[PDB]
From a paper:
Resistance nodulation and cell division (RND) efflux pumps are secondary active antiporters that are ubiquitous across all domains of life. As part of tripartite multidrug efflux systems in Gram-negative bacteria, they span the entire cell envelope and export a broad variety of structurally and chemically unrelated toxic substrates. Substrates can enter the PD through several channels and bind to the access pocket (AP) in the L state and the deep binding pocket (DBP) in the T state.
For the [name] variant we obtained two crystal structures in different space groups, which represent not only the TTT conformation, but also the [name] conformation as seen in wildtype [name]. Presumably, here, the closing of the DBP in the L state is also unfavourable due to the introduction of the hydrophilic asparagine within the aromatic cluster. This is likely less drastic than the effect of the V612F/W substitutions, but could still shift the equilibrium between the L and T states, hence, crystal structures were obtained in both [name] and TTT conformations. [name] also showed a similar reduced resistance for many of the tested drugs. Among the variants, V612F was the most compromised, while [name] showed the least compromised resistance.
Author numbering:
A (entry chain B): 1 to 1033
B (entry chain D): 11 to 166
C (entry chain A): 50 to 241
D (entry chain C): 722 to 769
E (entry chain A): 290 to 337
F (entry chain C): 50 to 97
G (entry chain C): 866 to 913
H (entry chain A): 674 to 721
Write the structure that this text describes.
């Protein structure tokens, strides 16, 4: 076929053209994002039940919903947790490959049908089905710098005036408010309530009656009296709109004609829906939007758009209010793209320079410079076609493919240049011969690298999705690089290269070039003399190969494994937990301390801290809090001492000094939502109805034993919360019935006053908003106050709550996990250093096997995945190695010669492992893909030498050692050129520091260290490999 | 409050006897109370940790400590069925006729959860069986209402 | 619960059927209302109908009828299912000790095995050959009259006294300055 | 285009002064002038 | 009594059910036992 | 039922609309609220 | 309608490029395609 | 597939006749069905 295009250069130009056009169009249209979606589809149900404890939530809501999650498809596991701020969350995790929209609507429909089985308060509140995404494009913070509006105000503003703006902004797929809009807060006073002999029940029924929508009908509605002339609507009562109105609600008319007014027993104000989170940004009140990028959207654009919209909102900001951007992935994605575009350009400047140094005519130096963009452009095409995005994974896979791309150009052009110098053939006859000499091998190389990278895409779950990115990027690049080298560069060679005289090896030139050429021709004799000696003595080299194979084996297992390196992301976070029973004030004082430390001791690095009192991973409560910390740029934080890993070490130490408060910091994972590749996720299950206390024991028993193998388990811990003192109040039915007091009166008085009670809606400023009745804090803080609430008896007397109740402390759970339907406790840990995850799990299973009967266990999370698809690697790589064999067998028409080539694989691996272990790096996906490419590329050179050698014997009848020495000579210059170019090309990634550099380091190191040894060792061992196998067979 | 007294409250609740032993070696506070008045004897008495109960009492723990609303470790023990702890506590001077702020007595609580042995022990050490709570119920009243006839018989 | 075939057709089946309109690829729709109090409406689709969307649609029109169904019928939970009429397999559960009655075995199957299998992907429907347990009150009128109470009084008191009651927190947000204690308030809970 | 509307305003205080339930008021006004769906019956085999 | 969801694979699903029942067996009360009275799937395996 | 177009818009149409954000292939979205209390919202999707 | 007009120019431009390229590839020539590609206004004027 | 040569047939009350009249109609059909056993076999209702 490459003859076809040597005679038809236009045709081939058209194919180039078309490919470049498809490429450029894909470039305008491809989605840009940090990472693809890799986590499996998860759908989280959410509900709330104001004033309710974790048990009530579970027994009335969580069980009901879980009992109904039947008949949804491709469910992997369900899990829930129910807690003491009245929240529930139920996460259904679906098989990888589920339509999240089919999955979400199936969850949503069974829930709907379960909705009539829920508490009436919970029905009134609503239950939200959502696709689970820790993937945020950015988070816009909104703060008041002049102390004029509280956190609630800011939030309401943001709700009424900013949220929907952003929602409609292009490329924004979802938006979450960090706060509530206003709510009408009635803050009752029980002294007044008892003065006029009213209860929370009267207050509620008056708000339901005087804040109503009343349908009324029409004037002159069909069917009319014929001859009516007017048809008009009748508007009767609508919702109230102001606090002034609510305060003027009539409760009681007296015997006196006076009026008890809802302002006479309660304080009325707009406020938050909850007051459970205190949020601050550098000590000032704050709210914000969390913005997720929409499907297909471009991150760099959406971000700009979000910002654009924001600016045109600023003109109407009330005084004091300011925007802040404390989290934004787009600068990463910018740097990434700029850095990859950087690398890809330096790449062609390098092949320019190396091409000229050796071949020293400009005409040749064109042929790679055309061919490389053709393939890169046409790779974006195939990317788009397969529905891929421009992301960090696909971008570095572009970088891992440069070597294979570069090489295809260098190989074809140089072998035409060499056939010319050696045979004095015109460029059309010379390329036609040169193509005849690599045309089979080049196709062979395509099949073989296929059998390298294609298996990698077929890994399962989260990890398969990350390998799928590189697999498709890299196979595409190489496949067009073979197309372009059989279609485009043959044509280009035949029609751009100037001729070369027979024998003219450029040694007669002068200056730097003529010297180089004689120097190199001397070194090609130097080289072939050396290899000819090696070939007199194969044995010590077989012994050295075993030494190499053996060192690689050792370095493999002792190189620790991760799956993606952390980054200095610009951000990190800091947990603050406090004892059972610790108040919100107390947690704010710790967060205040934590906040002060960063703005004092880390002034140089820190730009901001965002202090959320009330929230955390393990749970929620007045006694927990997260600070979120946002740093200045990597170019204003010089050197590793101002890296996150530094700043966190320091801060964690500082905070271990804090009294009655566990406080620590830590970096964010490379890919949000994934957890340690050294970690396990353990679910401990009540399997025959033991109860909370029993499962708690079985846990601590499992946690004790775990601590008795520090050699194997480390950081083995519970994920939930510990039981806590709570106030049990019992209602005397007998005293109630006797006193004429309803227990529904009792339990709504109590529930409304101390827990809050959602009544109905009102319309503030054209916006519909909630109305809550609750006590003033002053009367709902301490067990002593229970005696200040009065409930009316039938006979109208006001009976103090104490007269029919009693009370005691017990312990109880403020959070309550479940898992696939049963009660559970989630245990977390990792394998102690030097030990693998599958081991720490084996032991964790056995330690459980000796637990009380009625206690079971399962594997969830990352662990669930690796348990099901952590076995595949040696399966897959087997088929890989089999096809690679099967292919080379067909290339060379020999069952034995394959081995000569295959034997090259340790030679690249070794230096990758060496360079890794040296720089402290890790066996992760960037390293592993780079292995794959280092193998593929040194495979490439092996396949060409053996081919040239086998040819020289097959066709020209040369003896084995003769053929092998000639082969290794002709292929020396191309191999040198590719590696020198490429090695230099991956240089900036190894040296790279600052922005987003762990990714570049991971790719760079292993590819360069694997290349130094793959280049050096191969040129000698490959002729060795070939002669031992030809001899043995 | 102290670093140790909180560590002791924790170990007392959790039943980590050697922690309690080491803690008692170091003069941690047997009178440390948590946020609601529970001392580690409370914690032990409630959570059913006999060893720690003894160790604490041996180390000067107050057997007749009372919480924010009057519960004595005997109250907890009688109520959650920890016969041996009941016996120890009463041996070590636990007021068997302690009334919490509801006028609830370890007899009441025991009658109520129906711990017949614990009833008789408490009666043995002199549980006033005609004691009444806030609402005038005697452990007998609890017994007839819960439908427990053996208990009813024991309280004659 | 307790409705004859006509009460079930004229208060449920029909109300539903009149909403089952505009539904892609529907061929026919039959239904039985019987004196056990049960309805099953069976919408059948052309071959090639995507059963997921075919369910999403039927469910959509059904939730328009829901609020018009009796309160008794909603709390019994209405179901929508895409399965083959026939039985794939029957899983039997016995007791070889005889520590456990037919009624107990069934309550174990229903409370400890069913849900996980109902949640197994592939499983279009599960029929429990038996019955989960319930707290059964079995009234006696001879005594009901003897005290001048009625089934109405009973249901009222169970609703009152078998109550799971949200009751707030001590030191709950927004708290008072200087607040000491944060603890849940636990009041009535479900009976057991 | 914009229609007129007849706003009738009930006096809660006078309703309580004269002992009338705002719920019957609301139900009268609503039922009489707008209509009120009440339940279904059967017409020759059809729920209506 | 188990009915196979629309389209779903009979042999594949039988499998999944068996695996699910396996995780329960170790928690059965004394002498509780599974039995297999009606199964249409083995015939598919055998005849193929 | 029985609510002016403005009431129905504040409490129903605006609520639904502000959640019709980020949906695949949405070309535009039109919607109206009337004096009988009815609402319709029509999302139009890119042909294809 | 606004869209069909907005996209029409682009459509015409790429349809010329395609034809040209197909001509260059088929006839191995840049001249033959450029001779031909100039008859285009002759037909467009008559349609116009 | 069906039960071999089994036919499956429906009688409809297209006019509000009532359950009772439709039952007589079905009885009337079934009687005449039995009068052609050269053509019809095992003809029967499916209900109670």
């Amino acid at each position: 076929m490459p003859n076809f295009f040597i005679d038809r250069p236009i045709f081939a130009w058209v194919i180039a053209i078309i490919i470049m056009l498809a490429g450029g169009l894909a470039i305008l249209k491809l989605p840009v994002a940090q990472y693809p979606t890799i986590a499996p589809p998860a759908v989280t149900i959410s509900a709330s039940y104001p004033g309710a404890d974790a048990k009530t939530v579970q027994d009335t809501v969580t069980q009901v919903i879980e009992q109904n999650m039947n008949g949804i498809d491709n469910l992997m596991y369900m899990s829930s947790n129910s807690d003491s701020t009245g929240t529930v969350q139920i996460t259904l995790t679906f098989e990888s490959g589920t339509d999240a929209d089919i999955a979400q609507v199936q969850v949503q429909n069974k829930l709907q049908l379960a909705m009539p089985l829920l508490p009436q308060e919970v029905q009134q509140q609503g239950v939200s089905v959502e696709k689970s995404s820790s993937s945020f494009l950015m988070v816009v913070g909104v703060i008041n710098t002049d102390g004029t509006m509280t956190q609630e105000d800011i939030s309401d503003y943001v709700a009424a005036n900013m949220k929907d703006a952003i929602s409609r902004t292009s490329g924004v797929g979802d938006v979450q408010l960090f706060g509530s809009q206003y709510a009408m807060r009635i803050w009752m006073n029980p002294n007044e309530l008892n003065k006029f002999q009213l209860t929370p029940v009267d207050v509620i029924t008056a708000i339901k009656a005087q804040n109503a929508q009343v349908a009324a009908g029409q004037l002159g509605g069909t069917p009319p009296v014929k001859g009516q002339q007017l048809n008009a609507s009748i508007i009767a009562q609508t919702r109230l709109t102001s606090t002034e109105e609510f305060g003027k609600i009539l409760l009681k008319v007296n015997q006196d004609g006076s009026r008890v007014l809802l302002r006479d027993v309660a304080k009325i104000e707009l406020g938050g829906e909850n007051y459970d989170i205190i949020a601050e940004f550098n000590g000032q009140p704050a709210s914000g939007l969390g913005i997720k990028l929409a499907t297909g959207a471009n991150a760099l654009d959406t971000a700009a758009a979000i910002r654009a919209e924001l600016a045109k909102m600023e003109p109407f900001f009330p005084s004091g209010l300011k925007i802040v951007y404390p989290y934004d992935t787009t600068p990463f994605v910018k740097i990434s793209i700029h850095e990859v575009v950087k690398t890809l350009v330096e790449a062609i400047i390098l092949v320019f320079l190396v091409m000229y140094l050796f071949l020293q005519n400009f005409r040749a130096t064109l042929i790679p410079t055309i061919a490389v963009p053709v393939v890169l452009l046409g790779t974006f095409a195939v990317l788009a076609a397969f529905g891929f995005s421009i992301n960090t994974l696909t971008m570095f896979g572009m970088v891992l493919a440069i070597g294979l791309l570069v090489d295809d150009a260098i190989v074809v052009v140089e072998n035409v240049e060499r056939v010319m110098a050696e045979e004095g053939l015109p460029p059309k006859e010379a390329t036609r011969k040169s193509m005849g000499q690599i045309q089979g091998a080049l196709v062979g190389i395509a099949m073989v690298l296929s059998a390298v990278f294609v298996p990698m895409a077929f890994f399962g779950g989260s990890t398969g999705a990350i390998y799928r990115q590189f697999s498709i990027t890299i196979v595409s690049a190489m496949a067009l690089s073979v197309l372009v080298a059989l279609i485009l560069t043959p044509a280009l060679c035949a029609t751009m290269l100037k001729p070369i005289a027979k024998g003219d090896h450029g040694e007669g030139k002068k200056g730097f070039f003529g010297w180089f050429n004689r120097m190199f021709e001397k070194s090609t004799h130097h080289y072939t003399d050396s290899v000819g000696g090696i070939l007199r003595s194969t044995g010590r080299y077989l012994v050295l190969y075993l030494i190499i194979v053996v060192g690689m084996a050792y370095l493999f297992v002792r190189l620790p494994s991760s799956f993606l390196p952390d980054e200095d992301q610009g951000v990190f976070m800091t947990m603050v937990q406090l004892p059972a029973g610790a108040t919100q004030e107390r947690t704010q004082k710790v967060l205040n301390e934590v906040t002060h430390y960063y703005l004092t001791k880390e002034k140089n690095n820190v730009e901001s801290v965002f202090a959320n009192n009330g929230f955390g991973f393990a749970g929620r409560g007045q006694n927990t809090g997260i600070a979120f910390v946002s740093l200045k740029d990597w170019a204003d934080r010089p050197g590793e001492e101002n890296k996150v890993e530094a700043i966190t070490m320091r801060a964690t130490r500082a905070f271990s000094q804090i009294k009655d408060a566990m406080v620590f910091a830590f970096n964010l994972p490379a890919i949000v939502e994934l957890g340690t590749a050294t970690g396990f996720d353990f679910e401990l299950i009540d399997q025959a109805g033991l109860g909370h206390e029993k499962l708690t024991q079985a846990r601590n028993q499992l946690l004790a034993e775990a601590a008795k193998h520090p050699d194997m388990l480390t950081s083995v811990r519970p994920n939930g919360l510990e039981d806590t003192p709570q106030f049990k109040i019992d209602i005397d039915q007998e005293k109630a019935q006797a006193l004429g007091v309803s227990i529904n009166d009792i339990n709504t008085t109590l529930g409304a006053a101390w827990g809050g009670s959602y009544v109905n809606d009102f319309i503030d400023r054209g916006r519909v908003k909630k109305v809550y009745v609750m006590s003033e804090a002053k009367y709902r803080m301490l067990p002593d106050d229970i005696g200040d609430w009065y409930v009316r008896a039938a006979d109208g007397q006001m009976v103090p709550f104490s007269a029919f109740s009693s009370s005691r402390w017990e312990y109880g759970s403020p959070r309550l996990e479940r898992y696939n339907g049963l009660p559970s406790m989630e245990i977390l840990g990792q394998a102690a250093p030097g030990k693998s995850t599958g081991e720490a799990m084996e032991l964790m299973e056995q330690l459980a096997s000796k637990l009380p009967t009625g206690v079971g266990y399962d594997w969830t999370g990352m662990s669930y995945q690796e348990r099901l698809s952590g076995n595949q690697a040696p399966s897959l790589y087997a088929i890989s190695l089999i096809v690679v064999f099967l292919c080379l067998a067909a290339l060379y028409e020999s069952w034995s010669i394959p081995f000569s080539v295959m034997l090259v694989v340790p030679l690249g691996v070794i230096g990758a492992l060496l360079a890794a272990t040296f720089r402290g790096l890790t066996n992760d996906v960037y390293f592993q893909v780079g292995l794959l490419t280092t193998i593929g590329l040194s495979a490439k050179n092996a396949i060409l030498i053996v081919e040239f050698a086998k040819d020289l014997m097959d066709k020209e009848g040369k003896g084995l050692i003769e053929a092998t020495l000639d082969a290794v000579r002709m292929r020396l210059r191309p191999i040198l050129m590719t590696s020198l170019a490429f090695i230099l090309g991956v240089m900036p990634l190894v040296i790279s520091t600052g922005a987003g550099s762990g990714a570049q380091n991971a790719v760079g190191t292993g590819v360069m260290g694997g290349m130094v040894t793959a280049t050096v060792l191969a040129i000698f061992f490959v002729p060795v490999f070939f002669v031992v196998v030809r001899r043995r067979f | 409050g102290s670093d140790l007294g909180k560590k002791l409250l924790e170990a007392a609740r959790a039943g980590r006897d050697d922690e309690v032993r080491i803690l008692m070696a170091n003069g941690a506070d047997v009178n440390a109370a948590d946020v609601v008045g529970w001392t580690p004897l409370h914690l032990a008495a409630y959570w059913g940790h006999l060893e720690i109960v003894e160790v604490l009492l041996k180390n000067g723990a107050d057997v007749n400590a009372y919480d924010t609303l009057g519960s004595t470790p005997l109250h907890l023990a009688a109520h959650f069925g920890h016969l041996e702890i009941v016996e120890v506590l009463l041996k070590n001077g636990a007021d068997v006729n302690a009334k919490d702020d509801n006028g609830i007595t370890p007899l009441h609580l025991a009658a109520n959860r129906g711990h017949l042995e614990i009833v008789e022990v408490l009666l043995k050490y002199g549980a006033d069986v005609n004691a009444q709570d806030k609402f005038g119920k005697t452990a007998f009243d609890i017994s007839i209402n819960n439908g427990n006839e053996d208990l009813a018989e024991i309280l004659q």
